[PDB]
Amino acid sequence: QVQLVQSGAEVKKPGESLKISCKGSEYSFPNYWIAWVRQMPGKGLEWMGMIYPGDSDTRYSPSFQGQVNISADKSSRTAFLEWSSLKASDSATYFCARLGGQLWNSYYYYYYMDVWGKGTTVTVSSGYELTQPPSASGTPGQRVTISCSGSSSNIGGNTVNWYQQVPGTAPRLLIYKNNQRPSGVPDRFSGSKSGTSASLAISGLRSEDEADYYCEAWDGGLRGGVFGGGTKLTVLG
């Protein structure tokens, strides 16, 4: 099975350099974009940038460009994220993720992150987002909708994806291209988009649905993905 293998946890002091890695296995490594995503402790997902390993084409979020370096070694099927000088504020979990669209297949290309690495935690110490409600809750069976509000440059002109993240684990693609479900995602999950807003509906909650949910869309002005702040879903009981 396809996987992205990330390097182990790091504990560093402010000022030190660090390079972390993400090795792609069981697919054609040169032919898919790989994204890096930051999650500060207790916070949401942030798009850092992405690289196309075939030619090392790198596209950064303006929030991260000049602060980190993304690179790739085709021969070892590995992508990297590197800092020359860490700050305490760099403490976070870093995920790599494959963009699952097939660029060569002749169909219009949509951005979505289909396979995620397990994350690498980095602890450094010396001793714009889409709008989502921060929480949702219901008893088992409760119909719950989670909203995502954006603007013309993202949701208005681009497709929306949804990711589910159970604490301590990697996000999982739930809905892509507004309303399409990957195999394995149950039919109680559905997505819709209208104007500059999008919605994830859970027709009736199950206990295993307790998780954080993130919407995401490409922003044409920023030339990268933008995540919503996340909705923590509690199932009451």
Short mmCIF file of all heavy atoms in Angstrom, two decimals, residues 172 174 181-182 184-190 209, unseen atoms left out:
data_model
loop_
_atom_site.label_atom_id
_atom_site.label_comp_id
_atom_site.label_asym_id
_atom_site.label_seq_id
_atom_site.Cartn_x
_atom_site.Cartn_y
_atom_site.Cartn_z
N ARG A 172 -7.18 12.36 7.54
CA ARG A 172 -7.69 11.42 6.55
C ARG A 172 -8.60 12.20 5.61
O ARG A 172 -9.46 12.95 6.06
CB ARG A 172 -8.51 10.35 7.28
CG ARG A 172 -9.40 9.48 6.43
CD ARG A 172 -10.44 8.80 7.31
NE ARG A 172 -11.16 7.74 6.62
CZ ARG A 172 -12.32 7.24 7.04
NH1 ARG A 172 -12.91 7.73 8.13
NH2 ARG A 172 -12.91 6.26 6.36
N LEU A 174 -11.65 12.95 3.64
CA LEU A 174 -13.03 12.55 3.84
C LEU A 174 -13.92 12.83 2.62
O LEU A 174 -14.74 12.00 2.22
CB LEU A 174 -13.55 13.35 5.03
CG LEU A 174 -14.78 12.88 5.78
CD1 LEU A 174 -14.47 11.58 6.52
CD2 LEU A 174 -15.19 13.97 6.75
N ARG A 181 -16.70 11.13 -2.28
CA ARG A 181 -16.18 10.36 -1.15
C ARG A 181 -15.19 9.30 -1.58
O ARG A 181 -15.50 8.50 -2.46
CB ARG A 181 -17.31 9.64 -0.43
CG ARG A 181 -17.97 10.43 0.64
CD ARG A 181 -19.06 9.61 1.30
NE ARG A 181 -20.06 9.20 0.32
CZ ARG A 181 -20.30 7.94 -0.03
NH1 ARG A 181 -19.60 6.96 0.52
NH2 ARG A 181 -21.23 7.67 -0.93
N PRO A 182 -14.00 9.27 -0.96
CA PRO A 182 -13.06 8.17 -1.19
C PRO A 182 -13.70 6.85 -0.77
O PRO A 182 -14.57 6.83 0.10
CB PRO A 182 -11.91 8.49 -0.23
CG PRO A 182 -11.97 9.95 -0.03
CD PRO A 182 -13.44 10.30 -0.07
N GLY A 184 -14.23 3.75 1.30
CA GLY A 184 -13.97 3.55 2.72
C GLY A 184 -14.60 4.58 3.62
O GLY A 184 -14.82 4.34 4.81
N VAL A 185 -14.89 5.76 3.07
CA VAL A 185 -15.60 6.78 3.83
C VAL A 185 -17.09 6.52 3.72
O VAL A 185 -17.64 6.47 2.62
CB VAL A 185 -15.27 8.19 3.31
CG1 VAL A 185 -16.12 9.24 4.02
CG2 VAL A 185 -13.78 8.48 3.44
N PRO A 186 -17.77 6.34 4.87
CA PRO A 186 -19.18 5.94 4.84
C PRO A 186 -20.11 7.01 4.29
O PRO A 186 -19.81 8.21 4.33
CB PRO A 186 -19.50 5.66 6.32
CG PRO A 186 -18.51 6.44 7.08
CD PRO A 186 -17.26 6.47 6.24
N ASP A 187 -21.26 6.57 3.78
CA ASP A 187 -22.20 7.43 3.07
C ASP A 187 -22.91 8.44 3.96
O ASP A 187 -23.60 9.33 3.46
CB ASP A 187 -23.26 6.57 2.38
CG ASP A 187 -24.26 6.00 3.35
N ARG A 188 -22.76 8.33 5.28
CA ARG A 188 -23.35 9.33 6.18
C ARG A 188 -22.63 10.67 6.07
O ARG A 188 -23.16 11.70 6.50
CB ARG A 188 -23.40 8.84 7.63
CG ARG A 188 -22.06 8.62 8.30
CD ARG A 188 -22.27 8.24 9.76
NE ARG A 188 -21.02 7.96 10.46
CZ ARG A 188 -20.39 6.79 10.42
NH1 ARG A 188 -20.90 5.79 9.72
NH2 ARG A 188 -19.26 6.62 11.08
N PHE A 189 -21.43 10.66 5.50
CA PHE A 189 -20.69 11.89 5.24
C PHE A 189 -21.03 12.37 3.85
O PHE A 189 -20.97 11.60 2.88
CB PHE A 189 -19.18 11.68 5.33
CG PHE A 189 -18.70 11.40 6.71
CD1 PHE A 189 -18.45 10.10 7.12
CD2 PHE A 189 -18.50 12.44 7.61
CE1 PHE A 189 -18.00 9.84 8.41
CE2 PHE A 189 -18.05 12.18 8.90
CZ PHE A 189 -17.80 10.88 9.30
N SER A 190 -21.37 13.64 3.73
CA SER A 190 -21.58 14.22 2.42
C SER A 190 -21.11 15.67 2.44
O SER A 190 -21.06 16.29 3.51
CB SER A 190 -23.05 14.12 1.99
OG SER A 190 -23.89 14.87 2.85
N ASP A 209 -17.09 9.06 15.12
CA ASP A 209 -16.98 10.31 14.38
C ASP A 209 -16.33 11.42 15.21
O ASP A 209 -16.04 12.48 14.68
CB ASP A 209 -18.34 10.76 13.85
CG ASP A 209 -18.96 9.78 12.86
OD1 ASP A 209 -18.22 9.00 12.22
OD2 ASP A 209 -20.21 9.77 12.72
#
